[PDB]
Amino acid sequence: SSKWVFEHPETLYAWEGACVWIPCTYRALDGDLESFILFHNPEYNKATSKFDGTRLYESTKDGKVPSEQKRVQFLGDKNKNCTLSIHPVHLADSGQLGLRMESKTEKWMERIHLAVSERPFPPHIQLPPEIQESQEVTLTCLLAFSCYGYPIQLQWLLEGVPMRQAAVTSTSLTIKSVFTRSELKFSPQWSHHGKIVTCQLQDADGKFLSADTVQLNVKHTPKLEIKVTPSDAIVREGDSVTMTCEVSSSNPEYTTVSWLKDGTSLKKQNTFTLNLREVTKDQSGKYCCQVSNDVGPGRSEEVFLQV
Numbered sequence: 522s523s524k525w526v527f528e529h530p531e532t533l534y535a536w537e538g539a540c541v542w543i544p545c546t547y548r549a550l551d552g553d554l555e556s557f558i559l560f561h562n563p564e565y566n567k568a569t570s571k572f573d574g575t576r577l578y579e580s581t582k583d584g585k586v587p588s589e590q591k592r593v594q595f596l597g598d599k600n601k602n603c604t605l606s607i608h609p610v611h612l613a614d615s616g617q618l619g620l621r622m623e624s625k626t627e628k629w630m631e632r633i634h635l636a637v638s639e640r641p642f643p644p645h646i647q648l649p650p651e652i653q654e655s656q657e658v659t660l661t662c663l664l665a666f667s668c669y670g671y672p673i674q675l676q677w678l679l680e681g682v683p684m685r686q687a688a689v690t691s692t693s694l695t696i697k698s699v700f701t702r703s704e705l706k707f708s709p710q711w712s713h714h715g716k717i718v719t720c721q722l723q724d725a726d727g728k729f730l731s732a733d734t735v736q737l738n739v740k741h742t743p744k745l746e747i748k749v750t751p752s753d754a755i756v757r758e759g760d761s762v763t764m765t766c767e768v769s770s771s772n773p774e775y776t777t778v779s780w781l782k783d784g785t786s787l788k789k790q791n792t793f794t795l796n797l798r799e800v801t802k803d804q805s806g807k808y809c810c811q812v813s814n815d816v817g818p819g820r821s822e823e824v825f826l827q828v
């Protein structure tokens with residue numbers, strides 16, 4: 522009994538004040554249409570074996586001459602298209618819509634769910650699983666809404682400030698999926714680790730509607746800071762010098778630590794402190810530590826000993 526076959530999304534989302542555009546097609550194997558009624562939450566009376574409830578559209582009354590001012594409009598034909606449109610949609614419209622249709626001696630009822638919330642629902646940011654420094658990533662912000670009579674826009678904010686990188690916004694309004702996607706590419710620095718990325722929903726005039734925030738987990742090599750005593754780095758032979766190596770940032774945590782004298786690894790220096798108890802003249806160069814993690818080896822600044 523596959524007499525009727527409808528192609529449309531199973532659920533359409535919107536909010537109070539906006540509009541909703543419902544794509545819909547059908548194929549009636551039993552000729553063209555004779556009547557089309559649009560119920561809101563129809564209740565089937567088991568006694569009379571008919572459908573009751575508030576009728577939002579009747580093809581025999583408010584659809585005999587299309588009014589163009591109608592809030593609820595049927596944009597379809599007699600045997601193919603059942604695209605509905607409520608502009609503006611209200612909270613009292615949220616529910617289950619019924620597409621009661623009749624042809625020659627047979628009739629059919631079709632359900633469409635219309636979820637309308639009082640406030641604009643937030644979008645959603647889809648992050649890559651591993652974000653690493655100097656590697657371009659594509660952040661995806663999706664929104665399960667798109668209507669013609671109410672244009673929207675998605676805005677990317679980093680740390681509460683718009684991002685200079687351009688985005689690409691695309692909308693799909695088909696019988697399969699309805700959404701507004703905005704993708705943004707940018708090469709993250711190590712400092713972006715722990716920073717907040719926001720995707721804001723705004724109308725045509727740019728008024729804030731909703732948003733979704735995330736915190737970046739940017740892998741990076743250990744950024745190091747080196748200290749030396751004395752600060753002036755001046756000494757005589759035999760006297761002591763101490764250098765310290767402090768990991769200021771590393772994602773993930775560090776693994777090994779070694780020291781370098783003009784690019785030469787001093788052996789047995791597996792700690793963050795470099796003690797030169799009795800110095801000479803042949804030393805006196807440029808020192809730096811190397812701390813690594815899963816990401817790789819990170820190097821600190823250079824200090825001129827010069828003795």
Ligand SMILES: CC(=O)N[C@H]1[C@H]([C@@H](O)[C@@H](O)CNC(=O)c2ccc(-c3ccccc3)cc2)O[C@@](Cc2cn(C[C@H](O)Cn3c([N+](=O)[O-])cnc3C)nn2)(C(=O)O)C[C@@H]1O
Nearest residue numbers: 524562563564565567617618619627628629630631632633
């Ligand atoms: C080709 C054909 O044969 N077409 C049938 C047609 C169904 O095939 C067709 O409409 C399929 N779609 C549904 O069924 C349907 C049901 C509910 C909803 C919906 C939508 C929005 C909100 C709430 C609901 C949308 C679709 O059905 C009838 C009557 C008919 C009467 N019943 C009673 C039966 O007990 C099951 N039932 C009960 N109940 O409590 O049992 C409560 N409501 C029902 C249907 N079951 N069919 C009709 O005239 O529409 C005859 C017609 O010739």
Ligand SMILES: *[C@@H]1O[C@H](CO)[C@@H](O[C@@H]2O[C@H](CO)[C@@H](O[C@@H]3O[C@H](CO)[C@@H](O)[C@H](O)[C@@H]3O)[C@H](O)[C@H]2NC(C)=O)[C@H](O)[C@H]1NC(C)=O
Nearest residue numbers: 544545546595596597598602603604605669670694695696
């Ligand atoms: C069922 O029939 C209706 C009526 O034609 C179809 O609706 C029409 O669809 C087109 C494209 O989908 C709409 O064009 C759009 O216009 C806006 C401006 O309002 C523009 O910004 C878009 O880029 C696009 O050009 C059109 O407005 C819309 N309505 C009417 C009255 O024409 C509907 O597509 C049909 N259903 C299916 C599943 O095809």
